[PDB]
Amino acid sequence: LDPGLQPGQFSADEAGAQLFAQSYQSSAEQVLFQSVAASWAHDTNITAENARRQEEAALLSQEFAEAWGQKAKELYEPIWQQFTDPQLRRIIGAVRTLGSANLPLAKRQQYNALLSQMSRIYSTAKVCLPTCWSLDPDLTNILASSRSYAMLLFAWEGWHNAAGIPLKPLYEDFTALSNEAYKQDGFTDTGAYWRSWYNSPTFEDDLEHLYQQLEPLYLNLHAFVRRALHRRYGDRYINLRGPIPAHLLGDMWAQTWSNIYDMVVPFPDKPNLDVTSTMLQQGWQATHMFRVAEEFFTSLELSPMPPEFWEGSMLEKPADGREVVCHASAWDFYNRKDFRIKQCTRVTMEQLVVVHHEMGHIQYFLQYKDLPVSLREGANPGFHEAIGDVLALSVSTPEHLHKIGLLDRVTNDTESDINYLLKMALDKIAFLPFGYLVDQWRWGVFSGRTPPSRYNFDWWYLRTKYQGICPPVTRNETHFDAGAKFHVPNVTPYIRYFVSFVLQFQFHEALCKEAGYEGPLHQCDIYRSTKAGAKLRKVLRAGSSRPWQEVLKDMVGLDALDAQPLLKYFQLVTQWLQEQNQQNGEVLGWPEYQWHPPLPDNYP
Ligand SMILES: *[C@@H]1O[C@H](CO)[C@@H](O[C@@H]2O[C@H](CO)[C@@H](O[C@@H]3O[C@H](CO)[C@@H](O)[C@H](O)[C@@H]3O)[C@H](O)[C@H]2NC(C)=O)[C@H](O)[C@H]1NC(C)=O
Ligand SMILES: *[C@@H]1O[C@H](CO[C@@H]2O[C@@H](C)[C@@H](O)[C@@H](O)[C@@H]2O)[C@@H](O[C@@H]2O[C@H](CO)[C@@H](O)[C@H](O)[C@H]2NC(C)=O)[C@H](O)[C@H]1NC(C)=O
Ligand SMILES: O=C(N[C@H]1CCS[C@H]2CCC[C@@H](C(=O)O)N2C1=O)[C@@H](S)Cc1ccccc1
Ligand SMILES: *[C@@H]1O[C@H](CO)[C@@H](O)[C@H](O)[C@H]1NC(C)=O
Ligand SMILES: [Cl-]
Ligand SMILES: [Zn+2]
Fold first, then answer.
1. 473 contacts 362 by C-beta, under 8 angstroms
2. What is the crossing angle of helices 349-367 and 381-395, to 10°?
3. Which cysteines form disulfides?
């Protein structure tokens, strides 16, 4: 470590800690920048040499974290929790947690290389036929549009085998090293560290309570869709009292069901809410999608994207053969000037929502870029994942779609309200059990309750318990199906997305009220409301300088997560689905919990 980057001497009191924190920030932007730059070079150009430079930059950041983290612990560990300045507590509390910098050098290198190899394996896996298919776009498009049971099965099985099986031995080694590192920071395991970000002694209980309020909405949506799959695929493949086969819901992970809307739409006389075809007819490209998302932000008097964003971002999958990480992500280079999105954008309405999701992250970065780096975060990680989703709730309304030229006909009748709210539910309600269960699985792995000998046994227990799905071919412990989901090999926590999907309806209700809107919640559009813009900007400029409970209270009037706004948004289709399911005499749930589908006749 460069002498200029090493901490000096500071007194062991609160006044000394103020100067320590200032001195830390003055060096940290440089170190953070070089690490983001090296990760950007790798994820937009996966090569062995670019992995090697990324691991070298990671090692420098670990040296920096060790020098400052040890000094902070030595000077302030007994006392920082009593400091009068709550921003100072936030900063010092972060610096004394070293994470992987607790590992000796040889294990640091092992750790950095494991992350490199897990990322390469996930983002370069292919499914070849008996010329090979990538996940994005090839397999994504098959899962979304094919209605041949056997083609869907071939893609689903092929993807889970290709990505999961080789990941398993690396993921075991990663888990052990991660736990060894954070145990030296005082956390019982890595999962406990991740849960600490929510600053709540009752977190797990509070989540269970939320899900108990939401589960009935999921069970009715589930049974209604299951009936529809029955008519299409028949009794041989669909058990009206068992789990749904995991490959038939339009998405590789069965996490969002919007791609089978055409199969379930209650009233097809009304205007087709699937506006993708119109986007194609009109010539929309990826850059147009981003410009339309930007103009919603500026209509609220939030910031445009700076020139550095347009010149630096990767908004399409490269045509030149490069291997890249296609999973959509947003990037803060910690220099107050460079901010980018990396997305293999495809021209669809669902992707237009993802564009808003990622641009919400960049807007957060723009609004807090002048805080100290330790505070350039969301109030919690759920806040970050929700910002763009909130605006896209307004964009999705048929009224807004009309205003931007993607929906021609105009109707305001109960049947049209039902089509809209069902299409939204296929995305927002279907996701809830998946957003909840993923980190239940990972917390059990980190705690040792789930050893390698039960990785897949326990994955499928939770997938069946919560989503009511089952694998369409037989699995055993050679498979590692959790590993075939981006966030597991790329070590990105997941409970933030369950929090986000509840939070975004709390945000929407508040901003619609501030906008002066007085109609049904699900018809609100906050476009061009400078008052709603100013209330959102307060949240974004706070970063993590204040407890998320306080920030939320200012915004919506309540200091806790609450499912009632979500329930109120969906109320009308909740009632409709209950009545459809009673009328058809459905069983709510999957009491034949053992059931799996047979194979197709001469498969492959
Ligand atoms: C589509 O039609 C529905 C009615 O079928 C419209 O909903 C109604 O919209 C009005 C407009 O403000 C709402 O009026 C408000 O009522 C509350 C009731 O407490 C009151 O506090 C306000 O001062 C205001 O008068 C009304 O509540 C709402 N719901 C009804 C009539 O059942 C809707 O606006 C129409 N949407 C579009 C896009 O045209
Ligand atoms: C674990 O499963 C694999 C894959 O096949 C699964 O199990 C079969 C019995 C069948 O039900 C498939 O639909 C499942 O997906 C097993 O590996 C295969 O074993 C069969 C023998 O039955 C053999 O014909 C194949 O060549 C094998 N495939 C590969 C890639 O090796 C495996 O034996 C099962 N057990 C263990 C411990 O891994
Ligand atoms: O969050 C992200 N990308 C989105 C894009 C698709 S939509 C969205 C809502 C649904 C749940 C979740 C899903 O797709 O599984 N999700 C995403 O992953 C990125 S910013 C996560 C990330 C952060 C840092 C480095 C790398 C990645
Ligand atoms: C990809 O990275 C290599 C280094 O391994 C570099 O030589 C090459 O120019 C890069 N390609 C692009 C398109 O940036
Ligand atoms: Cl999280
Ligand atoms: Zn995100």
1. no
2. 130
3. 128-132, 326-344, 512-524
550 is in an annotated binding site: no
Method: X-ray
> How many Å lie between the centroid of ligand 5 and the Cα of residue 212?
20
Please give the single-letter amino acid code of residue 581: N
Task: From the CA of 358, give the closest atom in ligand 3.
Answer: 20
Q: Is the dihedral of CA 84, 90, 92, 96 positive or negative?
A: positive
Q: After which residues is the chain broken (C to N over 2.5 A)?
A: 130
Which neighbouring-strand residues pair with 339? Answer: 332
Name the residue at shortest CA distance from atom 14 of ligand 4.
Answer: 45
Looking at the DSSP assignment, which residues form a beta bridge with residue 314? 342
CA nearest to 276, candidates 348, 345, 344: 348
Q: To one decimal place, what's the resolution in Å?
A: 1.8
- Strand, helix or coil at 542? coil
**CA-closest candidate to residue 72, choices 374, 335, 376, 370:** 374
592 catalytic, yes or no?
Answer: no
Distance CA 394, CA 528 (A): 11
Residue whose entry in the numeric block shows the structure tokens 């209700």:
509
Contacts of 150 (CB under 8 A, 6+ apart): 600, 603, 604
**What are the φ/ψ torsions at residue 406 (nearest 5 degrees)?**
-105, -5
Cα–Cα distance for residue pair 302/87, rounded to 1 Å: 25
Dump strand ranges (E) for 232-371: 244-245, 329-332, 339-342
The two tokens of residue 97 are: 């947690």
Q: Determine whether the annotation assigns residue 350 to a binding site.
A: no
H/E stretch holding 470 reads strand 469-470
